[PDB]
Amino acid sequence: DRDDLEISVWKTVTAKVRAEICLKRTELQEYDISNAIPDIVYEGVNTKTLDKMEDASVDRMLQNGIN
């Protein structure tokens, strides 16, 4: 069970902080409970539509000079 790269390096580089966390609970990271934001089902466009309008205008330049 040592032929997995991303799980072995996750065991190695986190081995000090998780011992302190599990010693703290009996009184990047994915199990700090308080500092987590949820996910929205749909958020609106705020930047992609600008470049979408710009390369759409370039596409209206790309159609051989018809306005």
Partner: protein, 268 residues
Amino acid sequence: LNDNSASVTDTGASQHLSNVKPGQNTEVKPLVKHVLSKELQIYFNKVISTLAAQHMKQAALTSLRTDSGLHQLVPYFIQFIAEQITQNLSDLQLLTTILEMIYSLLSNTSIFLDPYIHSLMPSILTLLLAKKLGGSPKDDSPQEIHEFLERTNALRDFAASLLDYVLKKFPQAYKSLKPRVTRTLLKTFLDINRVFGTYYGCLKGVSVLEGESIRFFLGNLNNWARLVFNESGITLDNIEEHLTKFTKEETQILVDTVISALLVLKKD
């Protein structure tokens, strides 16, 4: 109550780029023990001590499920669920009771649980894909082998049907825990050196998905069978007493459960 030759090219290129990609934090404060009243932690220890006496356990389960006003203790429950999972991973009745109180909080529609979705999914995904769950099989008996196998498969079949409950309770987090969980299952499934029960939990978690994702495991199943079952040039005749990692009973369970989920892709 909130929490009161240059080295800057690493704290700016991979400490605020591989942190701004998973959200952002400003130090929500869990523990000073001044944030809970007296009666609130009286209720907290009175519910954590009882989890003739099955009536009190079901009363605590229903008080978690229906009562409101426990929005302050909901981070103290996911702490004292996770420690009684990763610290007491040998007793199946306590793991059953902890999965019951996971399901009881997950049906309470009067508390907001979408912050805590990432600290509640690894408990479900580690009681489903554990390398060992009981740990004390009481060997040198085939009856005890079968009894321990059914006792540890009841928890796989319960935790797999708790993963499907949280893929429907939170549909607003779709495309954020459907590909993550199916990537966890595809990562844990596609190897040789795992124990049988982890493969059973993986295939049951595949079964509690739906649609083309199950079709997404159609191609990489042939080589998985050719590596885990050793059909090195076999002609399907002596299959009863041919194979090498498993025993006959759990191979029959695997061939049963690999088409228990394959029936979904040919019924439409």
